[PDB]
Amino acid sequence: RRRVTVRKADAGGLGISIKGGRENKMPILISKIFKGLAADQTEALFVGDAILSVNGEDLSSATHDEAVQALKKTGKEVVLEVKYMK
């Protein structure tokens, strides 16, 4: 497992394309970490990261839409629990 915190601000966008969906047994796995962005500029948000919780939101029982909704309206610090699949 893993734990990454992406602070908002800076640039603005989060740069992060998650790929998966609770309708296919997939803990929302990142497939594209845009560069020059919070996720790719926090030395942790790297592709192959199955998120299971965003800001204390256990996404394990959430669909790909419930996971992107949190990343869309995150708080000052985007604490994202990740399951690296390297």
Binding site: S17, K19, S31, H64, K72
Partner: peptide
């Protein structure tokens, strides 16, 4: 599903 936040 491939979104982009």
């Amino acid at each position: 599903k491939e979104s982009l936040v």
